[PDB]
């Protein structure tokens, strides 16, 4: 597993590959890691599938009954609600999960929340089995404010090195864009991706 | 055990095989694995054989009550989270790895569903011993938009596969066919390519072979 | 003897006095509302009376935002209607999280009405003093009204009115139902069934509005969203260009 | 908070009666008449479908309700009681009955299990009765078809043909006149539709009346084709223009 | 609170009486008289059976004769759900029994367990009693035929005749009447049938309106064999007597 | 008949609940207080009975704060206050526990108006007999709210409850007409000094202590704090000058 | 009226009046008088204590809570003992877990939230007792008077229980002379005898009837009894 | 360490030509130790015949189960229960005990009383039904059971041929099996009558 979030200029764009492994065998080779727990604020999944997706539909449970009442939740909010189920938990749970979503007021922000299950707020985010490989890329390659463009192809450059070294990662890139325009879905095939 | 799961353009089929193994022994030749949890959603099961049964009857009781309360049509989705959270539960102890496939108001779907509660979705999907057996067929002649005779070929030599090629399965080929528009068709027994042959001698003991000690009548009625 | 009137057990005749007194505290605020269905829209649109000057008038409503696709309009005291709003949420969101799909209007009635029959039921708990009116666009359904009150009962409508004036914008509706032969307000946009729902309004309760008098609702597919202030000046200029 | 009311709120009179038993009887036989007749090769149950309003739809409210495939149910009374009361029957019989035998109770079970909530509803802490009468009609395959009366005080009778509601003794007297153990299942749905018409007041159609029948078993209903053994539901309601149909022959 | 509608079930009147087991009892007095007769040679169980019509199914209609064990049953006066409330946990009780000691459940045992549940809603719990007047009809290899009766109380006692139900009165003063300690089986179903027609508030003693039971050690068998009459053997056994 | 103001959750004939109303008698009997909504904050302003000169002075708070951006004040049973501010301090925490943010006022309002709605639903609780305003800063902008022992609340510009509650609600009015563009904080705390000098002639034989506390966004950072020292004594010369 | 509406504490009346809770404020002024008054150094609590017979001993009115911490009742004493426990419980949980003395404005507020609970719930019953709580903390000396409505008030000095008027008056015209008593034990406690013995009517204070009890700045919290208040009489 | 194979024994069930049988060991065992010659593992209710192999304590608990079970079932219904809904019954009653399960392998053999048609059916421990056609084996020397029964069973015998290929097909599994043999039992059942035989055999 290959995941990353990265806040830009105009929002933040989520990262990941579809590969579920159990073992040697790739179970799927077309998984969608990238989750929605509302509107505009996605999660990046990594560890257990199931721990990771029971996660997510709690969380997706508890942000919609919070629109229901309060309105539009923030991207810290989630984060929070993430970061409360990983944390007392965590004897039960081995799930990575990077909470990214887009506000008006505050744009685009990312939140990772590793296996203890604390929170950070980072510019940029990655983690996942193949994340250990692009530790030094993605240092040396991140700048904040940059375009839609620039973002795709840093994230694009990142998990193609990510699943070259990372036998647990493969399959397709996924993408999803978070703007003040919408969301939007982006995919990059092996043809492309690992020829860069 | 080895079972599939294949969409077409206007709807999606599961097969099995028939095999049922307590270890390396064949316990029944015949068994069917394709369940139902409501007239057009069907199931598919692997692993713990009485877990698959009970997980798959316990869901579909309360998908027959959850439609009549609804007054609607049971949803392959509403099957799905049922299933995921009663297996995430119990941590994976209840051994049901499931191929569940459906027609609904939405649609045609196909899912996978494993012992720890992780769901997957795809166009063709199989389980079980002979899984890797079947998945390279698959793999080899998928195409997109398949017609209805085209799935069901394509099913029934991933089962093949996973007959000739893996121990933990054999004997016939079970399909069924779930289109959009129709009601759901069970074909029992859809392909025997594994009959035996003759005896070459016949076993019929003569009467009075068997040395008897006591013999008495039951007494049945009340 | 004279505690069948106290608590919900049964009168000689055979009534609940407890259930009969919880529908006359549905037209303690003296507020009239009514729902009509369009060709691929639901609107509901309900009187807005704030007496007291020192009141927000942002903050004085009896329409809720139940789910997505949901929307509901009380007629009762509003403590009571805030107790079946949040009621409504919770099982509305639990049911998308054990079911997978999005609740139906007509399902969530039942769930409210069968809560209702309980209270009528057992002994502890009173009746709440509401009649709900949901509303959404189903995507089996279509167009949905479905209304519920102290009793537990619950029915779809192809249009209905709720208040102290309630027959005579139930009547208005009955007539134009027999004259235009169809169960639907045949237009396309819901701005103009929105019109519509107003100016049946007007006919029947022989009052005209100002944008601050009226509070609407509406639902489209996969949304139900209230009205502002200016969205209603908007719809009351239009209806205003006609007589 | 916490139900205080742990005592029971029907109690014994002087005179040996059960108050609030009585008054729910009062409150059935102010509801709308409903009616069974048991056939040869079926059951039939018939009520009217008294819609409140003109707006109102009455097709998104069914006063006859299937409990199992092969068994479906009718009330005269309180609406709401009967809906609640449907959800617990039809639950009873898969958490009682289906999920442990594997397969649908008799129609005697299922009105037993029905009249045991019932009962309950009359001796436990803090809760009135229901107020309704129910007229159960079911097919097994060891006692064929029954007909069954379930009421307030949780106490069922099996009848060849019966009614409750409004003109309950003008309808029972109707039926007693016409019935005969050799009666065909459309000969029952001619009865029906003939006692039901004393009843209703105003318009008499397939709009305004709800009818269903337990009789054959239906395979175009069943949903999938394949089990041999598998030959789809018994209970079947009437659509309104197969009402209507039989109207004319009326 | 909630003091103000407690009925309080379960309180002594200023003479030392229980007002629900009183108005119970009396409840019971208005249902269709039940008769147990015990024999030499068996027991016999018949009941009257209360309101009847023309449309009434007779062939499926259980009222009043239940049955508990293959050796004992019951007959009923009173509220019929009540009735099998209690007749349920009756037939539970005594499969526990065979559970643990592989043997039948002695008749006392099953009659003073059901009577100590009636006692229960008696002394505590802030219920109302069952409404029901049980005849226990059973046999053991220990006392042979036996004969029982409980009330609301969760009184029992052991009878040789005994009647439940409307005019306990006067069939109890037939039946001691015409009651002696070398009965046959077939004396006391005809017995039986006279005091019901003699106590009987409608106008003649039909099939239709009759429950018949008779709890018999069949001699061509040696096992006692329970035989709940159906409508045509009731009907048969009528015209025999000379009831018609 | 009669009898339905006995019991808490019973509807009476004309479908009121009389119990509730009580409460609110109760409220009416009490200490006047207001809440004041401006441009950026809310100011809370109360009467403080002195019963005798053995009272310390500015000792008896009556004002509370819930998490530190909510300020309560409320009027009639000062113990049933107390214990609802109890359960808004828990049910503040509890939101921040899960959602990270502060609990917004409109959705502390709420969370006030559910629990006080409940009380009216069981014979077994009692009224709450306080009606309290309440309010502060959040995400956006000020709220200002006042609770009802119903459980009703509404958003208000200017809100009053307690003995003087008429003469409280007519200075409030006049201050919304003259002021349609949003009265400052500064002005708010001047202002609500004088309302509760001239609500006092309901009260003007017994002498009283001010008590005012706000929370403003540009004065207080959106926090909730009391009114201390010089801008204290500013207020009640404001209002000593124009009681006459 | 009055008895339609007093047969428990859950039912307002048509006034808004509590009676259950007014009729256990009535078992206050059945009860003996007690006095409280402070100073800015020492706080001192002067009870009466009530004897049944002459045969009978002097019940005792005071209680301590904590080594800074003490207050006196009047009118149920098992009700006191309640409350008093739990007041000792709740200065034990602050001196464990947070190395703090609990504030004496803090623990009126534990009592009247305690007190409250009996008044909103049905089978509940009011408490029967009125408590004059004196300590010293971090701000100087206190004096607080509970009341079973719930009610704490905060004050210089006050008189609960029969007659307490009396002293009420007394102390509330000494308001200028006793809260200037710094730095004197002795002077403070006179001060709340002369006015004890303004709610006197039918015998005098004596030696086995007087109970004094004092807490200050370098004094912990120690109750008088007997021989320990002759130099007061 | 095995429960299942701590007391040892065996039950084989097959079908015939409008009959069914059901066979079963005598031996009750406590490991290497015989202990008795007596311990019979078919049992009936009604028409339903139910044989129970493993663990002696929960052959013995379960026959005084559904023995608790069929006896409630009859007085509610008001007749004898079908070996198609007895099987259910079973299934259900050892899922039940998913986590704490009965060391057991029952065999439900039976003639349904409307339709006459013969019925056989296989359990594991936790109530998977295995409905075989032709027939069903459990015990401790299963494998040879197996292997006897694919070998000597063909379809269509009748009742005295099926006692014949069933009791050959017992013997010989149980003389290869030390936890086995000790006296055997065969049942012959039909639609009318059904028979009890005492079969002579090794006692070794
Ligand atoms: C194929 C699965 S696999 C693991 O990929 O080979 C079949 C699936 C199947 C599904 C449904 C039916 C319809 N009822 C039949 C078959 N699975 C099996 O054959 C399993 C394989 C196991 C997981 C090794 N075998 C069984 O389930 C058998 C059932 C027989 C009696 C019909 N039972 C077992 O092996 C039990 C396992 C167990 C042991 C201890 C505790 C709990 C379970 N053992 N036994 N007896």
């Not at chain 2, 509660?117 to 938009?145: F, N, R």
């Not at chain 6, 500064?186 to 001010?210: C, G, M, P, S, T």
Request: proline share 3%; charged share 25%; net charge negative.
């Amino acid at each position: 597993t290959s995941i990353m979030a990265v806040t830009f200029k105009d929002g933040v764009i989520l990262g990941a590959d579809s590969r579920t492994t159990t073992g040697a065998y790739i179970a799927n080779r077309v998984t969608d890691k990238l989750t929605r727990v509302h509107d505009k604020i996605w999660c990046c999944r990594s560890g257990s599938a199931a721990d990771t997706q029971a996660i997510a539909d709690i969380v997706q449970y508890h942000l919609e009954l919070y629109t229901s009442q309060y309105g539009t939740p923030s991207t810290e909010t989630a984060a929070s609600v993430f970061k409360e189920l990983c944390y007392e938990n965590k004897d039960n749970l081995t799930a990575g999960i990077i909470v990214a979503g887009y506000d008006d007021k505050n744009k685009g922000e990312v939140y990772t929340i590793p296996l203890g299950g604390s929170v950070h707020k980072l510019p940029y985010a990655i983690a996942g089995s193949g994340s250990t490989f692009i530790y030094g890329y993605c240092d040396k390659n991140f700048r904040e404010n940059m375009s839609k463009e620039e973002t795709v192809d840093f994230i694009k450059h990142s998990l193609s090195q990510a699943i070259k070294w990372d036998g647990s990662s493969g399959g397709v890139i996924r993408m999803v864009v978070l703007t003040a325009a919408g969301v939007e879905r982006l995919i990059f095939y092996p043809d492309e991706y690992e020829q860069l | 055990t080895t079972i599939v799961g294949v969409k077409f353009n206007n709807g999606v089929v599961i097969a099995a095989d028939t095999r049922s193994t307590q270890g390396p022994i064949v316990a029944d030749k015949n068994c069917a694995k394709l369940h139902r949890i409501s007239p057009k959603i069907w199931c598919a099961g692997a692993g713990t054989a009485a877990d698959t049964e009970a997980v798959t009857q316990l869901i579909g009781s309360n998908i027959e009550l959850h439609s009549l309360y609804t007054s609607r049509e049971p949803r392959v989705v509403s099957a799905l989270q049922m299933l995921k959270q009663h297996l995430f539960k119990y941590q994976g102890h209840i051994g049901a790895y499931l191929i569940v496939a459906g027609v609904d108001p939405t649609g045609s779907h196909l899912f996978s569903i494993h012992a720890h509660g992780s769901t997957d979705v795809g166009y063709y999907l199989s389980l079980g011993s002979g899984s890797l057996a079947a998945m390279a067929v698959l793999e080899s002649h998928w195409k997109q938009d398949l017609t209805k005779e085209e799935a069901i070929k394509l099913a029934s030599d991933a089962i093949q596969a996973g007959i000739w090629n893996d121990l933990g399965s054999g004997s016939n080929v079970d399909v069924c066919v779930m289109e959009i528009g129709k009601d759901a068709e069970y074909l029992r027994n859809y392909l025997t390519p594994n009959v035996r042959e003759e005896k070459q001698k016949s076993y019929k003991f003569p009467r009075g072979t068997t040395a008897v000690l006591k013999e008495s009548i039951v007494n049945i009625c009340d | 003897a004279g505690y069948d009137r106290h608590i919900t057990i049964f009168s000689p005749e055979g009534r609940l006095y407890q259930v009969e007194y919880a529908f006359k505290a549905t037209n303690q605020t003296n507020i009239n509302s009514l729902a009509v269905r369009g060709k691929d829209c639901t609107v509901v649109i309900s009187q807005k009376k704030v007496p007291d000057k020192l009141l927000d008038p942002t903050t004085v409503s009896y329409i809720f935002c139940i789910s997505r696709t949901i929307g509901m309009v009380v007629n009762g005291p509003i403590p009571d209607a805030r107790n079946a709003a949040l009621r409504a949420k919770a099982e509305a969101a639990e049911f998308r999280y054990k079911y997978g799909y999005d609740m139906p209007c007509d399902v969530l009635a039942k769930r409210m009405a069968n809560l209702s029959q309980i209270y009528t039921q057992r002994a502890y708990m009173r009746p709440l003093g509401v009649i709900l009116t949901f509303v959404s666009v189903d995507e089996e359904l279509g167009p949905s009204i479905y209304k519920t009150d102290p009793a537990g009962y619950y029915v779809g409508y192809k249009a209905t009115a709720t208040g102290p004036k309630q027959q005579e914008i139930t009547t208005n509706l009955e007539n134009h139902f027999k004259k235009s032969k169809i169960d639907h307000i045949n237009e396309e946009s819901w701005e103009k069934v929105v019109e519509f729902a107003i100016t049946h309004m007007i006919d029947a309760l022989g009052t005209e509005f100002s944008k601050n008098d009226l509070e609407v609702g509406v639902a489209t597919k996969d949304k139900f969203f209230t009205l502002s202030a200016e969205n209603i000046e908007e719809r009351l200029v239009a209806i205003a260009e006609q007589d | 908070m916490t139900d205080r009311y742990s005592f029971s709120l029907t109690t014994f009179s002087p005179s040996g009666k059960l108050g609030q038993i009585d008054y729910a009887l009062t409150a059935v036989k102010q509801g709308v008449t409903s009616l069974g007749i048991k056939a040869t090769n079926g059951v039939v149950i018939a009520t009217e479908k008294k819609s409140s309003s003109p707006l109102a739809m009455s097709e998104t409210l069914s006063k006859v309700s299937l409990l199992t495939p092969d068994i479906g149910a009718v009330y005269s009374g309180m609406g709401p009681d009967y809906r609640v009361l449907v959800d617990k029957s039809r639950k009873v019989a898969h958490t009682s009955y289906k999920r442990i035998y594997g397969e649908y109770p008799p129609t005697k079970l299922l009105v037993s299990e029905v009249a045991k909530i019932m009962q309950e509803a009359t001796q436990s802490g803090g809760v009135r009765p229901f107020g309704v009468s129910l007229l159960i009609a079911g097919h097994d395959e060891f006692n064929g078809f029954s007909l069954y009366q379930v009421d307030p005080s949780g106490s069922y009778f099996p009848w060849k043909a019966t009614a409750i509601g409004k003109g309950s003794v003008a309808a029972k007297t109707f039926l007693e006149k016409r019935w005969n153990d050799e009666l065909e299942l459309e000969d029952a749905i001619h009865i029906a539709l003939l006692t039901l018409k004393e009843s209703v007041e105003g318009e008499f159609n397939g709009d305004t009346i709800e009818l269903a029948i337990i009789g054959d078993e239906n395979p175009d209903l069943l949903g999938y084709t394949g089990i041999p053994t598998d030959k789809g539901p018994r209970f079947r309601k009437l659509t309104s223009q197969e009402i209507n149909d039989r109207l004319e022959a009326l | 609170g909630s003091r103000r509608y407690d009925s309080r079930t379960t309180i002594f009147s200023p003479e030392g009486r229980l007002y629900q087991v009183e108005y119970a009892l009396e409840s019971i007095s208005h249902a269709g008289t039940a008769i147990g007769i015990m024999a030499s040679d068996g027991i016999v169980l018949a009941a009257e059976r209360k309101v009847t019509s023309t449309l009434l199914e007779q062939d499926t209609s259980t009222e009043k004769l239940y049955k508990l064990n293959d050796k004992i049953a019951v007959a009923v006066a009173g509220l019929t759900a009540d009735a099998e409330i209690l007749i349920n946990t009756a037939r539970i009780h005594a499969q526990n029994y065979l559970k643990t000691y592989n043997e039948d459940i002695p008749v006392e045992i099953l009659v003073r367990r059901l009577s100590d549940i009636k006692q229960g809603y008696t002394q505590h719990g802030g219920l109302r009693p069952f409404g029901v007047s049980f005849i226990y009809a059973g046999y053991d290899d220990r006392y042979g035929y036996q004969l029982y009766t409980s009330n609301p109380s969760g009184n029992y006692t052991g009878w040789k005749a005994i009647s439940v139900g409307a005019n306990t009165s006067a069939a109890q003063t037939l039946l001691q009447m015409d009651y002696k300690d070398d009965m046959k089986v077939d004396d006391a179903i005809e017995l039986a049938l006279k005091t019901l027609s003699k106590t009987t508030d409608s106008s003649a003693l039909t099939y239709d309106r009759l429950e018949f039971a008779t709890i018999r050690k069949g001699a061509n068998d040696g096992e006692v064999y329970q035989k709940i009459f159906k409508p045509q053997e009731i009907k048969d056994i009528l015209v025999k007597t000379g009831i018609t | 008949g009669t009898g339905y103001d006995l019991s808490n959750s019973v509807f009476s004939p004309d479908g009121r609940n009389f119990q509730v109303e009580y409460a609110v008698k109760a409220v009416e009997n009490g200490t006047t207080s207001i809440g004041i909504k401006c441009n950026d904050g809310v100011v809370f302003a109360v009467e403080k009975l002195i019963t005798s000169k053995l009272l310390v002075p500015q000792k008896n708070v009556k004002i509370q704060v819930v998490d530190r951006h909510i300020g309560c004040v409320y009027s009639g049973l000062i113990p049933d206050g107390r214990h609802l501010v109890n359960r808004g301090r828990e049910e503040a925490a509890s939101f921040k526990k899960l959602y990270k943010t502060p609990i917004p006022i409109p959705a502390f309002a709420d969370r006030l108006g559910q629990y006080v709605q409940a009380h009216t639903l069981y014979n077994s609780v009692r009224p709450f007999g306080v009606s309290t305003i309440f309010g502060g800063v959040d995400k956006n902008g000020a709220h200002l709210y006042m609770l009802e022992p119903s459980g009703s609340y509404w958003g208000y510009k200017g809100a009053a409850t307690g003995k003087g509650r008429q003469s409280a609600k007519a200075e409030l009015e006049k201050l919304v007409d003259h002021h349609p563009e949003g009265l400052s904080a500064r002005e708010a705390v001047k202002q609500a000094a004088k309302i509760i000098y001239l609500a006092h002639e309901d009260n003007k034989e017994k002498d009283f202590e001010l008590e005012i506390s706000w929370c403003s966004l540009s004065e207080t950072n959106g926090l909730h704090k009391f009114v201390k020292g010089d801008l204290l004594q500013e207020a009640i010369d404001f209002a000593q000058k124009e009681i006459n | 009226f009055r008895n339609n509406y007093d047969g428990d504490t859950v039912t307002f009346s048509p006034t808004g009046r509590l009676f259950q809770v007014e009729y256990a404020l009535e078992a206050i002024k059945q009860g003996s008088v007690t006095v409280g008054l402070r100073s800015n150094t020492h706080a001192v609590l002067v009870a009466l204590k009530r004897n049944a017979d002459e045969l009978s001993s002097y019940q005792k009115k005071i209680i301590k809570c904590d080594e800074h911490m003490g207050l006196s009742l009047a009118g149920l004493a098992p009700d006191a003992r309640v409350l008093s426990n739990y007041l000792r419980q709740q200065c034990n949980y602050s001196s464990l877990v947070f190395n703090r003395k609990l504030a004496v404005e803090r623990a009126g507020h534990l009592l009247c939230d305690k007190a409250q609970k009996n008044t909103q719930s049905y089978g509940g019953r009011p408490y029967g007792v009125g408590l004059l709580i004196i300590g010293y903390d971090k701000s100087g000396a206190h004096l607080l008077e509970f009341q079973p409505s719930g009610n704490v008030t905060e004050l210089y000095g006050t008189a609960i229980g029969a007659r307490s008027q009396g002293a009420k008056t007394y102390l509330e015209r000494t308001l200028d002379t006793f809260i200037k008593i710094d730095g004197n034990p002795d002077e403070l406690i006179k001060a709340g005898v002369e006015a004890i013995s303004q709610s006197l009517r039918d015998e005098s204070l004596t030696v086995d009837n007087l109970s004094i009890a004092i807490v200050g700045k370098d004094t912990p919290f120690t109750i008088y009894d007997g021989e320990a208040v002759a130099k007061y009489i | 360490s095995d429960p299942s194979s701590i007391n040892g024994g065996i039950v084989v069930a097959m079908t015939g030509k409008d009959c069914v049988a059901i066979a079963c060991d005598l031996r009750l065992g406590s490991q290497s130790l015989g202990v008795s010659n007596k311990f019979e593992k078919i049992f009936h209710y009604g028409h339903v015949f139910l044989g129970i192999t493993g663990l002696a304590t929960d052959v013995t608990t379960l026959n005084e189960m559904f023995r608790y079970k069929t006896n409630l079932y009859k007085l509610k219904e008001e007749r004898a229960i079908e070996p198609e809904t007895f099987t259910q019954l079973v299934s259900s009653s050892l899922y039940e005990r998913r986590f704490g399960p009965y060391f057991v392998g029952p065999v439900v053999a039976g003639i349904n009383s409307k339709s006459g048609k013969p019925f056989i059916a296989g359990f594991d421990l936790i109530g998977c039904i295995d409905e075989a056609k032709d027939f069903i084996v459990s015990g401790t020397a299963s494998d040879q059971l197996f292997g006897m029964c694919e070998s000597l069973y063909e379809p269509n015998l009748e009742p005295e041929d099926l006692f014949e290929t069933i009791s050959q097909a017992l013997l010989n599994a149980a003389d290869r099996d030390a936890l086995s043999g000790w006296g055997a039992v065969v049942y012959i059942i039909k639609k009318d009558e059904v028979v009890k035989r005492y079969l002579k055999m090794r006692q070794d």
